[PDB]
Design a protein around this ligand. Structure first.
Ligand SMILES: Cc1cc2nc3c(=O)[nH]c(=O)nc-3n(C[C@H](O)[C@H](O)[C@H](O)COP(=O)(O)O)c2cc1C
Ligand SMILES: Cc1cc2nc3c(=O)[nH]c(=O)nc-3n(C[C@H](O)[C@H](O)[C@H](O)COP(=O)(O)O)c2cc1C
Lengths: 208, 208
């Protein structure tokens, strides 16, 4: 029941995530375990957020793909800092991730783009993400038109579409309790309460 | 199936939300329909996000309660701008809300605080939200101690704890489709594509 520090799994939060992620996949009550909210803001400080999907994670951090000329793409391409929220309601858990964002290698994006379903690939070409359009049939038309063009061919990845990777600086692990005393263990990159994790990671408990 | 403009419900997005919110409550597959992600950032432009609960909504906007001396409280109390994401997975819908944030009346917060369960009330007093603490038993101790103190009494609302209201400037209604051509209708406070809604609201369709 109790989410303890001396319990846990790893003092590396990336490995601790992997542990928590696995349990999320294993829960049949969770649809998309990799569904996350991605928060960005302008250099000025105008925040925005939308749902994404995590597309792989590792030592380098957390990967996700989108249009660069989209609202969030522009926000990142002038203010490369992001936050992530994972929420698993049935497990009553939350993971918050913060850090700077590097654009992924071009040819790496090529590889992934071509592993997506055919329909998904074409969708990326019709859609200038977050741009004003006249009506819904506009999209439906251009889509069926591109289906004809890339009949028995492969869709070239548009220059607009690629990936990002968030290098984690801060990682919170939130475990809700019925007594309202939620367990919060936060990792960041010493005082009597601050402890050392793996590498340059430090962890401490926060009040709920 | 198709989320149309000439379908919809109201040209007032607050009323359109009410319509979408009601369907979320009615769905038995949705636990907390009012569960939302709240994105804030520093004046500098350092974004952060966490799950909250919506606690009422109306003409004035969207209300939610927290500690003001919390991380997000401070971010708001120096940069009163926020974003909200509602995600209803079974309905495959997303609502994004953006606008400035006013702190709620003190006595209004008093009223609400005292309508929360006894345990919840005490929880607000033990917990200096987002502050470093030594261990989990620390909380558990102080909590049981305050239970003795407020035996057959009422908990005074701490000065730290209160509410906020986000006055909506932008409101996106996202409806996912299997063909990847997600319907996006965005309201904001004229061109050939921009249409007029109720009051000073304008709406347009965005590419997915
Ligand atoms: C569950 C879910 C997953 C999503 N995943 C992605 C994604 O991986 N990439 C993406 O570009 N948009 C994704 N979207 C759509 C975004 O929420 C958003 O509508 C779009 O990226 C435009 O964001 P922007 O207006 O902030 O640029 C997803 C939406 C939902 C509901
Ligand atoms: C479903 C859910 C609902 C929550 N609702 C609230 C809430 O209404 N108010 C609140 O202060 N924290 C709420 N929390 C906790 C926050 O996510 C977060 O841990 C806390 O507010 C500290 O935020 P901060 O560190 O950004 O200040 C909720 C958490 C979850 C998972």
């Amino acid at each position: 029941e109790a989410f303890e520090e001396t319990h846990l799994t790893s003092l590396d939060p990336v490995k601790q995530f992997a542990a928590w992620f696995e349990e999320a996949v294993q829960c049949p009550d969770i649809g998309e375990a990799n569904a996350m909210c991605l928060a960005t803001c302008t250099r000025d400080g105008k925040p925005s957020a939308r749902m994404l999907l995590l597309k792989g994670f590792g030592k380098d951090g957390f990967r996700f793909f989108t249009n660069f000329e989209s609202r969030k793409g522009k926000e990142l391409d002038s203010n490369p800092f992001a936050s992530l929220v994972f929420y698993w309601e049935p497990l009553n858990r939350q993971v918050r991730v913060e850090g700077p964002v590097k654009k992924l290698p071009e040819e790496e994006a090529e590889c992934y783009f071509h592993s997506r379903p055919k329909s998904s690939q074409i969708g990326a070409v019709v859609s200038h993400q977050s741009s004003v359009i006249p009506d819904r049939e506009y999209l439906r038309k251009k889509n069926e038109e591109l289906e004809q063009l890339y009949q028995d061919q492969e869709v070239p990845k548009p220059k607009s579409w690629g990936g990002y990777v968030l290098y984690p600086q801060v990682m919170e692990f939130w475990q809700g309790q019925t007594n309202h005393l939620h367990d919060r263990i936060v990792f960041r990159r010493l005082g009597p309460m601050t402890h050392r994790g793996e590498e340059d990671w430090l962890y401490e408990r926060l009040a709920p």
